[PDB]
Amino acid sequence: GPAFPGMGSEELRLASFYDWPLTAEVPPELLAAAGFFHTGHQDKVRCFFCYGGLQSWKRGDDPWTEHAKWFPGCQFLLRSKGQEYINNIH
Ligand SMILES: [Zn+2]
């Protein structure tokens, strides 16, 4: 199951970005959709399912792409985006 089942709701994940410092650069909507919630006040996020943590976001980074790049074994990623998507990023 998920590492953090309490953050399984996309809407709850989205709410966590109320204090996101990079709104124009990396949209909260895309982050939440990609399984990520905001951890702290800076630019750190974690996936609710695999608990993979990402920081140092650059402008235009794509949350799904980053999810697949760094945590290709995540089952939420697989279920959401499929194996072909993951393979093509790798
Ligand atoms: Zn994940």
UniProtKB/Swiss-Prot annotation:
Domain of life where this protein originates: Eukaryota
CC annotations in GO: centrosome; cytoplasm; cytosol; Golgi apparatus; nucleoplasm; nucleus
BIR repeats, residue ranges: 13-78
Cellular compartments annotated: Nucleus; Cytoplasm; Golgi apparatus
Expression (tissue specificity): Isoform 1 and isoform 2 are expressed at very low levels or not detectable in most adult tissues. Detected in adult heart, placenta, lung, lymph node, spleen and ovary, and in several carcinoma cell lines. Isoform 2 is detected in fetal kidney, heart and spleen, and at lower levels in adult brain, skeletal muscle and peripheral blood leukocytes.
Molecular-function GO term, any one: zinc ion binding
Main location: nucleus
Keywords: Apoptosis, Cytoplasm, Golgi apparatus, Metal-binding, Nucleus, Protease inhibitor, Thiol protease inhibitor, Transferase, Ubl conjugation, Ubl conjugation pathway, Zinc, Zinc-finger
PTM per Swiss-Prot/TrEMBL: Autoubiquitinated and undergoes proteasome-mediated degradation.
GO BP, sorted A to Z: apoptotic process; lens development in camera-type eye; negative regulation of apoptotic process; negative regulation of tumor necrosis factor-mediated signaling pathway; positive regulation of JNK cascade; positive regulation of protein ubiquitination; protein ubiquitination; regulation of apoptotic process
Residues binding Zn(2+): C47, C50, H67, C74
Impact when changing D43A: Abolishes inhibition of caspases, SMAC binding and anti-apoptotic activity
Domain notes: The RING domain is essential for autoubiquitination.
Biological role stated in the UniProt entry: Apoptotic regulator capable of exerting proapoptotic and anti-apoptotic activities and plays crucial roles in apoptosis, cell proliferation, and cell cycle control. Its anti-apoptotic activity is mediated through the inhibition of CASP3, CASP7 and CASP9, as well as by its E3 ubiquitin-protein ligase activity. As it is a weak caspase inhibitor, its anti-apoptotic activity is thought to be due to its ability to ubiquitinate DIABLO/SMAC targeting it for degradation thereby promoting cell survival.
Subunit structure, as described in the record: Binds to CASP9. Interaction with DIABLO/SMAC via the BIR domain disrupts binding to CASP9 and apoptotic suppressor activity. Interacts with TAB1. In vitro, interacts with CASP3 and CASP7 via its BIR domain.
Entry similarity comment: Belongs to the IAP family.
Protein name: Baculoviral IAP repeat-containing protein 7
Organism: Homo sapiens
Gene that encodes it: BIRC7
Span of the entire protein shown here: 78 to 159 of 298
